Amino acid sequence: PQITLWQRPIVTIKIGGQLKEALLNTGADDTVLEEVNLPGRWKPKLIGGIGGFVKVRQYDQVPIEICGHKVIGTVLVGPTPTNVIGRNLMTQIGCTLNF
Amino acid sequence: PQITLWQRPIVTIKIGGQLKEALLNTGADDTVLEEVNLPGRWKPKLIGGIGGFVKVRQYDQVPIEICGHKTIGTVLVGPTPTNVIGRNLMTQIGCTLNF
Ligand SMILES: Cc1cccc(C)c1OCC(=O)N[C@@H](Cc1ccccc1)[C@@H](O)C[C@H](Cc1ccccc1)NC(=O)[C@H](C(C)C)N1CCCNC1=O
C-alpha cells in the first residue's frame, strides 16, 4: 500500500497465529512486539538503553504478515509501549519512505 | 527520493540556517530537533511522557528543508537523543510509506 503519515502508520500484523496492531516505525531498527508467544529458540537481546536496557527475546526468522505481506524476520518479543515494526521488517516487506 | 530502510533513514534537514541530520521517524508524531535556535514565539510542549515528560519548545510554521524539500511545520526544539523528523513534517514533504 501507500501509507500517508497523517496518522500513526499502524498496521495489522499476523504473527504467532495472532492478529496484532503494530506501528510502522522507521525510527526503530528492530521490531518489538508485546505479548506474543513465539515458538522455539530465542536469544536474549537488550534493547533501548537510555536509562537502562530492556531485555527482550530475539526470535529470528519469524514468519510475520504485515498488511498481507508475508515476510520473515527477527522479532523481538518483550515489553514495548506499543508494538513496533522496525526497519528490519520494513525492508522485508519492501517498505520504503517516498517523497 | 525513495528511501529504503536497510539503514536508519537519516536525512539532511535545513533549519534555523543550519544543516542538520535527522531521522525520518514514522514512529514519531512530532519533529524534535536539538540545538537549533529558532526565532520568534514558541510555546512549551511536553513530549515523551514515559517516566516523565520532557519540556521542549514548540515552534510553529517553521521553514525546514528536508532532503531539499522546503516545507513548513511544527518543530519541537529541545533534548532529543537523535534529531527526529516526525510524521508532522513527513506529511508536509509528502513522505509516505510504500510497499
Ligand atoms: C534507536 C534504536 C537503537 C537500537 C535499536 C532500535 C530498535 C532502535 O530504535 C527503536 C527506538 O528506540 N526508536 C525511537 C528512536 C530512539 C533513538 C534514540 C534513543 C531512543 C529512541 C523512535 O525512533 C521511535 C519511537 C516510537 C516508540 C515506540 C514504542 C515505544 C517507545 C517509542 N517514537 C517515540 O518515542 C516518540 C517520542 C517523541 C515519545 N513517540 C512515541 C510515543 C507516542 N509519540 C511519539 O511520537
Side-chain angles (χ1 to χ4, degrees):
Chain A
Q2 165 163 107
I3 298 169
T4 59
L5 291 160
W6 300 100
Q7 299 313 308
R8 293 171 172 167
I10 289 147
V11 291
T12 300
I13 67 175
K14 195 185 250 181
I15 190 178
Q18 284 158 76
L19 281 177
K20 293 202 140 23
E21 295 292 278
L23 174 66
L24 300 171
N25 191 340
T26 64
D29 302 335
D30 299 320
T31 289
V32 181
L33 304 177
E34 113 257 280
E35 72 180 275
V36 57
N37 192 359
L38 294 185
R41 78 163 88 266
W42 49 269
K43 62 192 187 177
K45 180 153 170 79
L46 294 168
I47 58 163
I50 291 71
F53 289 83
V54 166
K55 182 179 316 194
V56 293
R57 289 183 289 177
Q58 172 179 338
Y59 292 86
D60 295 319
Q61 285 157 352
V62 183
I64 178 165
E65 196 161 353
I66 297 150
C67 282
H69 282 67
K70 299 186 204 178
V71 289
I72 282 176
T74 290
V75 174
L76 306 187
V77 174
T80 176
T82 173
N83 288 337
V84 168
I85 302 310
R87 295 186 291 103
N88 76 297
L89 290 191
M90 286 185 277
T91 59
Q92 297 307 292
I93 69 189
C95 180
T96 53
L97 290 161
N98 294 88
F99 59 105
Chain B
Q2 160 158 117
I3 299 156
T4 63
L5 292 163
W6 300 98
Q7 302 311 316
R8 292 176 176 163
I10 290 152
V11 290
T12 299
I13 66 167
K14 205 153 215 256
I15 191 178
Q18 297 155 82
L19 279 176
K20 293 224 138 54
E21 302 292 278
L23 174 68
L24 299 171
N25 190 342
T26 65
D29 303 333
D30 300 318
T31 291
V32 185
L33 298 174
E34 52 152 48
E35 70 179 321
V36 91
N37 196 359
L38 292 184
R41 88 156 26 93
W42 50 269
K43 61 199 194 178
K45 173 155 180 82
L46 296 175
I47 58 163
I50 298 168
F53 291 83
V54 165
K55 184 181 321 172
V56 295
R57 287 184 294 176
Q58 176 181 332
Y59 289 89
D60 294 318
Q61 284 160 353
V62 184
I64 179 172
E65 198 163 7
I66 298 159
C67 268
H69 285 65
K70 283 214 180 172
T71 53
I72 283 181
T74 291
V75 172
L76 309 185
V77 178
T80 173
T82 182
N83 283 337
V84 171
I85 305 304
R87 297 184 290 100
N88 77 296
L89 289 194
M90 288 184 274
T91 58
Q92 298 304 301
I93 68 186
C95 180
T96 54
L97 289 160
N98 293 81
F99 59 105

